[PDB]
């Protein structure tokens, strides 16, 4: 998260950490949508161009954390995966279309003050809230700055980061990049003229884009961090997987398994 702040404790109890058993490494971010399911970006699991094709047995999911690096004894809960489900039409080949994936824990996680799921938007929330100019939040332990030889400094955060950003209009999104965009994606970020900063960045993929509902006091998960071109660049916005759009796939896996 570029230009965010530390998160406060229990601010995002649905934030999950995708961690590698070996070598120990943060792979990505995820979201707790229920007690036996986590949502994340497919590209965290499968990206051939970079050689990623992980099995259930190569990862762990850590829920309840604040520290990035510490083992939060008695706070976090570490879970094993039972199975991974990638949208069958996920396109790693070109634009990352349909970059979403569910994971099924081996055993249900117990909720606490630090672990609690997020809701998934319905038609009505979706239409009320995903509108241009409206702000959502993004969290992650991803990089703090876009990677560059010339960066002097820690590029890593020591505690979860937060950043609120406004959702942008399709046409502005579509014109800012040359990657082919689809309706399954949304872009969020300050426009050139609002002269402000903030963004997701590498290592934040899989994390939730959430919005809070004035209509009911609940936080809904609106998007998944998916891609971008650099981090915080001028005239650029980051892309998120449109969760509502793909809710049907989501319900189906969750209902057969």
């Amino acid at each position: 998260i570029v230009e965010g702040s530390d998160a406060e404790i229990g601010m995002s109890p649905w934030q999950v950490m995708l961690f590698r058993k070996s070598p120990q490494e943060l792979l990505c971010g995820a979201s707790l949508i229920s007690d036996r399911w986590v949502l994340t970006a497919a590209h965290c699991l499968l990206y051939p161009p970079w050689d990623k094709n992980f099995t259930e047995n190569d990862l762990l999911v850590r829920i309840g954390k604040h520290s990035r690096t510490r083992y939060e004894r008695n706070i976090e809960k570490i879970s094993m995966l039972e199975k991974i489900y990638i949208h069958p039409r996920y396109n790693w080949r070109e634009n990352l279309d349909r970059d979403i994936a569910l994971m099924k824990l081996k055993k249900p996680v117990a909720f606490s003050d630090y672990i609690h799921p997020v809701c998934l938007p319905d038609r009505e929330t979706a239409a009320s809230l995903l509108q241009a100019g409206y702000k959502g939040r993004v969290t992650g332990w991803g990089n703090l700055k876009e990677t560059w030889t010339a960066n002097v400094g820690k590029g890593q955060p020591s505690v979860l980061q937060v950043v609120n950003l406004p959702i942008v209009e399709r046409p502005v999104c579509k014109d800012s990049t040359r990657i082919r965009i689809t309706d399954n994606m949304f872009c969020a970020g300050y426009k050139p003229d609002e002269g402000k900063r903030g963004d997701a960045c590498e290592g934040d993929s899989g994390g939730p884009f959430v919005m809070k509902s004035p209509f009911n006091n609940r936080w809904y998960q609106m998007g998944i961090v998916s891609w971008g071109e650099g981090c915080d660049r001028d005239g650029k916005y980051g892309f998120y997987t449109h969760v509502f759009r793909l809710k049907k796939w989501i319900q189906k896996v969750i209902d057969q398994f």
Partner: peptide, 11 residues
């Protein structure tokens, strides 16, 4: 970088 996690998890 990462504090060591217990061995039962790192299956």
């Amino acid at each position: 970088d990462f504090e060591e996690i217990p061995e039962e998890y790192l299956q």
